[PDB]
Amino acid sequence: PKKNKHKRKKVKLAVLKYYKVISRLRRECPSDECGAGVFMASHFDRHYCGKCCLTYC
């Protein structure tokens, strides 16, 4: 029962998923500080914001 530390999953080229070729594949946050650069998660049942924890279902 040793306390193992979390290791962050090194996703290879995580930058290269929000666009094709032009436009944005993912959603953008409608908040003031978050948005125009802040992408949203696209989960199988929800949308999640990595900055202000905004949740849309």
Partner 1 sequence: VNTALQEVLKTALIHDGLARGIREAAKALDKRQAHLCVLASNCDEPMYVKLVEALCAEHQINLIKVDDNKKLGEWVGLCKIPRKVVGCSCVVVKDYGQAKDVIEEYFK
Partner RNA sequence: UCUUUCUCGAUUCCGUGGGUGGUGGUGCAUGGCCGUUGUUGGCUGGUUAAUUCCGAUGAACG
Site residues, partner 1 (CB under 8 A): 15-16, 19, 21-22, 36-38
Beta-sheet strand order (sheet of 47-49): 40-42, 47-49, 55-56
Regarding 16 and contact with RNA (CB under 7 A), the answer is no
Between 22 and 33, name the residue whose CB sits nearer to RNA. Answer: 33
Tell me how far apart the alpha carbons of residues 26 and 17 are, in angstroms, rounded to a whole number.
Answer: 9
Regarding 20 and contact with RNA (CB under 7 A), the answer is no
* Torsional sign, CA 52, 32, 46, 55: positive
- Per CB under 7 A, residues contacting RNA are 3-6, 8-9, 11, 14, 18, 26, 37-42, 48-51
